[PDB]
Design a protein around this motif. Sequence first.
Motif, mmCIF file in Angstrom:
data_model
loop_
_atom_site.group_PDB
_atom_site.id
_atom_site.type_symbol
_atom_site.label_atom_id
_atom_site.label_comp_id
_atom_site.label_asym_id
_atom_site.label_seq_id
_atom_site.Cartn_x
_atom_site.Cartn_y
_atom_site.Cartn_z
ATOM 1 N N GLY A 142 -7.799 -3.935 7.460
ATOM 2 C CA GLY A 142 -7.741 -4.889 8.555
ATOM 3 C C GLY A 142 -6.302 -4.868 9.045
ATOM 4 O O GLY A 142 -5.411 -5.398 8.415
ATOM 5 N N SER A 143 -6.060 -4.248 10.201
ATOM 6 C CA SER A 143 -4.692 -3.968 10.635
ATOM 7 C C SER A 143 -4.615 -4.112 12.150
ATOM 8 O O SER A 143 -5.532 -3.600 12.826
ATOM 9 C CB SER A 143 -4.317 -2.538 10.255
ATOM 10 O OG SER A 143 -2.945 -2.251 10.419
ATOM 11 N N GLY A 174 -0.809 -1.518 12.228
ATOM 12 C CA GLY A 174 -0.829 -0.316 11.441
ATOM 13 C C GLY A 174 -0.343 -0.392 9.999
ATOM 14 O O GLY A 174 -0.544 0.582 9.270
ATOM 15 N N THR A 175 0.275 -1.495 9.581
ATOM 16 C CA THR A 175 0.823 -1.572 8.225
ATOM 17 C C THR A 175 -0.275 -1.520 7.180
ATOM 18 O O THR A 175 -0.179 -0.741 6.235
ATOM 19 C CB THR A 175 1.635 -2.855 8.051
ATOM 20 O OG1 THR A 175 2.503 -2.994 9.186
ATOM 21 C CG2 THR A 175 2.471 -2.840 6.786
ATOM 22 N N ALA A 228 -4.633 -7.690 6.826
ATOM 23 C CA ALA A 228 -3.652 -8.551 7.465
ATOM 24 C C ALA A 228 -4.270 -9.794 8.072
ATOM 25 O O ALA A 228 -5.423 -9.752 8.513
ATOM 26 C CB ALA A 228 -2.866 -7.799 8.533
ATOM 27 N N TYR A 235 -3.841 -12.395 11.421
ATOM 28 C CA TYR A 235 -3.251 -12.327 12.788
ATOM 29 C C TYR A 235 -3.537 -13.615 13.553
ATOM 30 O O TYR A 235 -4.121 -14.535 13.031
ATOM 31 C CB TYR A 235 -3.740 -11.068 13.535
ATOM 32 C CG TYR A 235 -2.885 -10.577 14.713
ATOM 33 C CD1 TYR A 235 -1.557 -10.245 14.543
ATOM 34 C CD2 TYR A 235 -3.436 -10.430 15.997
ATOM 35 C CE1 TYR A 235 -0.790 -9.794 15.606
ATOM 36 C CE2 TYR A 235 -2.676 -10.010 17.078
ATOM 37 C CZ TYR A 235 -1.350 -9.673 16.875
ATOM 38 O OH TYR A 235 -0.567 -9.237 17.921
ATOM 39 N N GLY A 277 -4.234 -17.537 11.736
ATOM 40 C CA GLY A 277 -5.143 -17.455 10.617
ATOM 41 C C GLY A 277 -6.427 -16.666 10.878
ATOM 42 O O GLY A 277 -7.394 -16.814 10.168
ATOM 43 N N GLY A 292 0.575 -10.839 5.153
ATOM 44 C CA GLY A 292 0.824 -12.008 5.984
ATOM 45 C C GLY A 292 2.299 -12.299 6.096
ATOM 46 O O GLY A 292 3.121 -11.412 5.922
ATOM 47 N N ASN A 293 2.623 -13.537 6.413
ATOM 48 C CA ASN A 293 3.979 -13.905 6.743
ATOM 49 C C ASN A 293 4.055 -15.422 6.586
ATOM 50 O O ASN A 293 3.388 -16.141 7.286
ATOM 51 C CB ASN A 293 4.291 -13.440 8.180
ATOM 52 C CG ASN A 293 5.644 -13.860 8.645
ATOM 53 O OD1 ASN A 293 6.158 -14.930 8.243
ATOM 54 N ND2 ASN A 293 6.259 -13.050 9.501
ATOM 55 N N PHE A 333 -0.985 -20.588 8.469
ATOM 56 C CA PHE A 333 -2.175 -20.127 7.749
ATOM 57 C C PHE A 333 -1.852 -18.823 7.000
ATOM 58 O O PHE A 333 -2.298 -17.728 7.326
ATOM 59 C CB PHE A 333 -3.345 -20.006 8.746
ATOM 60 C CG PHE A 333 -3.687 -21.313 9.415
ATOM 61 C CD1 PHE A 333 -4.323 -22.320 8.708
ATOM 62 C CD2 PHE A 333 -3.312 -21.554 10.708
ATOM 63 C CE1 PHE A 333 -4.609 -23.538 9.316
ATOM 64 C CE2 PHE A 333 -3.584 -22.769 11.326
ATOM 65 C CZ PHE A 333 -4.231 -23.759 10.627
ATOM 66 N N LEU A 377 7.177 -7.756 1.672
ATOM 67 C CA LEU A 377 5.831 -7.174 1.821
ATOM 68 C C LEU A 377 5.664 -5.868 1.080
ATOM 69 O O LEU A 377 4.713 -5.697 0.305
ATOM 70 C CB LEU A 377 5.480 -7.026 3.303
ATOM 71 C CG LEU A 377 4.213 -6.235 3.595
ATOM 72 C CD1 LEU A 377 3.033 -6.988 3.081
ATOM 73 C CD2 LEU A 377 4.087 -6.021 5.091
HETATM 74 C C1 LIG Z 1 1.135 -12.386 16.467
HETATM 75 C C2 LIG Z 1 1.127 -12.502 14.979
HETATM 76 C C3 LIG Z 1 0.425 -13.496 14.334
HETATM 77 C C4 LIG Z 1 0.444 -13.545 12.935
HETATM 78 N N1 LIG Z 1 -0.280 -14.506 12.297
HETATM 79 C C5 LIG Z 1 -0.213 -14.605 10.969
HETATM 80 C C6 LIG Z 1 -0.896 -15.683 10.295
HETATM 81 O O1 LIG Z 1 -1.550 -16.543 10.933
HETATM 82 N N2 LIG Z 1 -0.766 -15.708 8.964
HETATM 83 C C7 LIG Z 1 -0.059 -14.797 8.247
HETATM 84 O O2 LIG Z 1 0.046 -14.911 6.995
HETATM 85 N N3 LIG Z 1 0.559 -13.752 8.803
HETATM 86 C C8 LIG Z 1 0.509 -13.641 10.148
HETATM 87 N N4 LIG Z 1 1.147 -12.576 10.768
HETATM 88 C C9 LIG Z 1 1.874 -11.619 9.941
HETATM 89 C C10 LIG Z 1 1.126 -10.255 9.864
HETATM 90 O O3 LIG Z 1 -0.123 -10.368 9.126
HETATM 91 C C11 LIG Z 1 2.027 -9.260 9.142
HETATM 92 O O4 LIG Z 1 3.146 -8.918 9.980
HETATM 93 C C12 LIG Z 1 1.327 -7.985 8.688
HETATM 94 O O5 LIG Z 1 2.158 -7.255 7.803
HETATM 95 C C13 LIG Z 1 0.835 -7.082 9.815
HETATM 96 O O6 LIG Z 1 -0.031 -6.093 9.272
HETATM 97 P P1 LIG Z 1 -0.607 -4.984 10.302
HETATM 98 O O7 LIG Z 1 0.609 -4.168 10.824
HETATM 99 O O8 LIG Z 1 -1.500 -4.154 9.448
HETATM 100 O O9 LIG Z 1 -1.330 -5.684 11.416
HETATM 101 C C14 LIG Z 1 1.174 -12.512 12.176
HETATM 102 C C15 LIG Z 1 1.899 -11.559 12.835
HETATM 103 C C16 LIG Z 1 1.878 -11.498 14.197
HETATM 104 C C17 LIG Z 1 2.690 -10.401 14.795
#
Ligand SMILES: Cc1cc2nc3c(=O)[nH]c(=O)nc-3n(C[C@H](O)[C@H](O)[C@H](O)COP(=O)(O)O)c2cc1C
Length: 635
Positions: free
Chosen positions: A20-21, A24-25, A72, A74, A77, A108-109, A114, A147
Amino acid sequence: SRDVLSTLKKNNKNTLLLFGSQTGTAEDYANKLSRELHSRFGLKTMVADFADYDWDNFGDITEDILVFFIVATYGEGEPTDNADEFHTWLTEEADTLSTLRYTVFGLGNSTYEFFNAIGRKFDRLLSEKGGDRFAEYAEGDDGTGTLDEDFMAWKDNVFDALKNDLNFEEKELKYEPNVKLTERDDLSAADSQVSLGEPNKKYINSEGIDLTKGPFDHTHPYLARITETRELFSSKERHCIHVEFDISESNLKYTTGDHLAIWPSNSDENIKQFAKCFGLEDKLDTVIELKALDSTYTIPFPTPITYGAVIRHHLEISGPVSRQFFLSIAGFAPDEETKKTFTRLGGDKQEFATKVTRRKFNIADALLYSSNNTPWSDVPFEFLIENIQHLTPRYYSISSSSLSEKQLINVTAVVEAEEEADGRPVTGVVTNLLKNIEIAQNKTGEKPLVHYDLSGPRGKFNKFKLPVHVRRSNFKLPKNSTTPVILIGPGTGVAPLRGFVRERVQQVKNGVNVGKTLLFYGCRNSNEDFLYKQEWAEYASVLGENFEMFNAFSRQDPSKKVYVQDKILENSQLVHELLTEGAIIYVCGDASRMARDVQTTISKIVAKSREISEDKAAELVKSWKVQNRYQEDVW
Ligand SMILES: Cc1cc2nc3c(=O)[nH]c(=O)nc-3n(C[C@H](O)[C@H](O)[C@H](O)COP(=O)(O)O)c2cc1C
Ligand SMILES: Cc1cc2nc3c(=O)[nH]c(=O)nc-3n(C[C@H](O)[C@H](O)[C@H](O)COP(=O)(O)OP(=O)(O)OC[C@H]3O[C@@H](n4cnc5c(N)ncnc54)[C@H](O)[C@@H]3O)c2cc1C
């Protein structure tokens, strides 16, 4: 073809890795884990995008399949777009998964409210529905910078579970290629079938195909001409670019509040250092063809292609280096003195962080440090294709209004660039690309820090085109135009808010009854970095007393540093009055600090104005987020 169970069986796979990306991470982690599981444990692995399968039968998965979910969180939540249908299935349709064996890693972050909602939810629901969790849940935090090491620690625990609970034999990591490269010395740039970095194969054939017609998405961009650019900051050392993309001759569509994805290319400087590191500097025009060695491996770019096109247009050569990359490539070290240094750094989390991560080395720089500038000429280029993530689009909040200018897309991008004490440039890929375009397009006489190929593959990016696509967002003005709105977006957070204000301005011109619009903006100094400074009075003239803007300057006076939350508090009576009229709140920009400080300030206003405790008010404000009455576009 969309039956994942049938797909595993047909391809003779016993291990499923689902990602779930959005950027891309999670995909890169799933690929890293898959290769290690295959090499160390003999597992027959398949990496799958949730979007490539339907999930209605997934409850039938058998106990012989190990499943790894790398997911991930996004938006607010919410699942990543690619996981949305799986998320709907699991939460709403799935009954039982009585012979599922699984494990989950959440990305996440912790600056978002959330935190890792999706990984936590998947891990809990899978168990509740009868799944067997064979390795403990863990999660990574992109907000604190842990991360990658969180993933590595989780992976180490997964391997312990396989070895000690499931009694798998664990062997040493070895590179086992999923792709084979052959050099085509008979082919060259003269051969029209050879890619020179076109975004996909539709751009390589395309003799009498309409490349302006739909649809455009993450697999297929539109080459959009930049008709104008403007530097928006007056500071010599800090830049922000306004970009106007002409979309009039295409079927590319957007709605106010959507995101534009800009497809990058790499800088000349980073490419040079990468080619030097791997001994490819005399090979960049050489053509290669790639063949999959595994029936479930997708070659991630067009073939045939030159080495230089792969490096410039397809590989994420810049950015933080994963310690797992050191572990994976160590076998190819050019000499014994290098292997000793490199093995030590790869095995010691803290020394890696000090000697590589905090120096902001790219791959090329980290490997040349370790080898005292001896090239890593023994590294198979196939290894790099598999072990470096694909170069992924960056998202920008569209700053134009689709009502006002359906034929143009604006974005507003702050440029990320610095130079290290040793002279290395550390740069944001897309934003320095946009700055280079602005410099060239306006003949400004600035010297770019890094440079890019502005003409593109076969000249196809000429007249300042870039590949783009639009992602639809749920960051949207209210259906009812009379509903008041409160818009909070300092710095580049103002970008979608400019779009919103421009939309409401046009609506008033179309004789629409529009509700009050309150805008809270901030920047360092009114004469340095005030985005779109001239425009706001022009909008005010149209919207009249239905628009008020308050500005917070953080650096104008050193004794009183002011931020948007200070202006919201100063204007609390007005803010709360609008809340009582059902105003929708929109917060845009910095997730790390601003969004949280603003939310706290709004909660305090609600507490005072309604005679409720601060914690009750905070809980109310959280419910407004869940209900989409308080919306965020924060990054
Ligand atoms: C627009 C945006 C919204 C995000 N919302 C959340 C969130 O609600 N909860 C969370 O834990 N992380 C959130 N993140 C952090 C992402 O999950 C994190 O940067 C992740 O490593 C991205 O993985 P991916 O590159 O595979 O999509 C968010 C990041 C972005 C850029
Ligand atoms: C929904 C959404 C909306 C957005 N809206 C906007 C917007 O409207 N405007 C805007 O400006 N941005 C916006 N962003 C942010 C944007 O997508 C990019 O993240 C940002 O512009 C940086 O992209 P880049 O390619 O220039 O930098 P990247 O190449 O992704 O680099 C990121 C950072 O890492 C640094 N870096 C490079 N190499 C290394 C290394 N080896 N080690 C450590 N650090 C390194 C770079 O210099 C930079 O500071 C938004 C993001 C999202 C998710």
